[PDB]
Amino acid sequence: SFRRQRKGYEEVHVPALKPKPFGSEEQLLPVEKLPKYAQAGFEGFKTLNRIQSKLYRAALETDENLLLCA
Amino acid sequence: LGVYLTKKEQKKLRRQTRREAQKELQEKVRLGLMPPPEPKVRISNLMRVLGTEAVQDPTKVEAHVRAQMAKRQKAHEEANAARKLTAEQRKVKKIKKLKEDISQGVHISVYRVRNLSNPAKKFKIEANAGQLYLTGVVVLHKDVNVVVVEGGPKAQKKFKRLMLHRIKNKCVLVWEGTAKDRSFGEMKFKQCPTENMAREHFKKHGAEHYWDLALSESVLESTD
């Protein structure tokens, strides 16, 4: 952060962090890969998020206890 | 040439420069460029600036005060060492290598010693010639030590006081003058039992009059 005191207050500005780049085997999966029980829940969303696609099979195909630190 | 500002003028210049720097700092603090200065706290000052907080956490306050004191010392020590770095290069190469500006004239001093059998005096003369970068030679003969030293004016003034006062049979400068260029090489020793062998060596550089003056001074000393 800037951590500088201009006049009466110390402003600390941390810049915009760069996002994590997608690898060769990681991409935003659409709603065309979801099953019929999960296609009805994604109403109005043709695609999914990056964090939703990176842990799609761990939460929909696996019945284990998921811990999403999003 | 250069001019010398007087003591009052030096005081005025220093005061104006200090006030300029102080105003620079004050306007930097006014506009928020630099943080406002913190009070300078020493151990005797600790109970006046940090008095109310030194009862709750006395040792934290002591540590903070001593850290400030060290940082003030850290800056000063670093500053002195930083400037000292200049000598690191500007020392035996730029604070001791002058050469007295011997370019247009080489002062030459010729001394005639009666007894120079001690090697310690010859070693000290060679060390003084090599340390002051003064060229010349020394010719030995039967009760005749002709030491010619050509160098700068400061080196000649040092060698005139070293040979006549700092070294002890008598030493007398027979010829003290200047020349156009240099005639003798580095400081070396040469023994000549005959006067002709010394006169032939002195005539190789065009300084045959130094041996004839030293022979005439010895003849005038042995006559009277």
Binding site: - | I43, L46, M47, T52, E53, A54, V55, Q56, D57, P58, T59, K60, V61, E62, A63
Partner: protein
């Protein structure tokens, strides 16, 4: 303190003794901080003398040599002990006066440590204003 009570209870004759309440603090801190921490420690002992004795030794590896009174601690160890004892001293003021410790300004914590307290039974003198 454990080194004074039993020492003077069993003293069969009156006498005059010398102690060094600053064990080795003067070798690392000035007498001002030494006296401030000594006042803080004595206030803590006067407050509890039960939890304070537990605070005075922060680790099982801290012992008091027979030469002096207080245990030998590192500088930051003494900082931590002092902040713990300050919390202890504020604890009884919070309890016996039913006031929050956070409500204590930095100006009145100093008065609490030193030992100055004020009371006012006659609030009717509000007539002055």
């Amino acid at each position: 303190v454990e080194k004074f009570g039993d020492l003077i209870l069993k003293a069969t004759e009156p006498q005059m003794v010398l102690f060094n309440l600053y064990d080795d603090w003067l070798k690392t801190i000035s007498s001002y901080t030494a006296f401030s921490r000594l006042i803080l420690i004595l206030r803590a002992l006067h407050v509890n003398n039960d939890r304070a004795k537990v605070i005075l030794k922060p680790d099982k590896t801290t012992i008091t040599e027979p030469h002096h009174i207080w245990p030998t601690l590192t500088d930051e160890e003494w900082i931590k002990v002092e902040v713990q004892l300050k919390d202890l001293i504020l604890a009884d003021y919070g309890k016996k006066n039913n006031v929050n410790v956070a409500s204590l300004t930095q100006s009145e914590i100093r008065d609490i440590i030193l030992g100055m307290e004020i009371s006012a039974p006659s609030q009717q003198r509000q007539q002055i204003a």
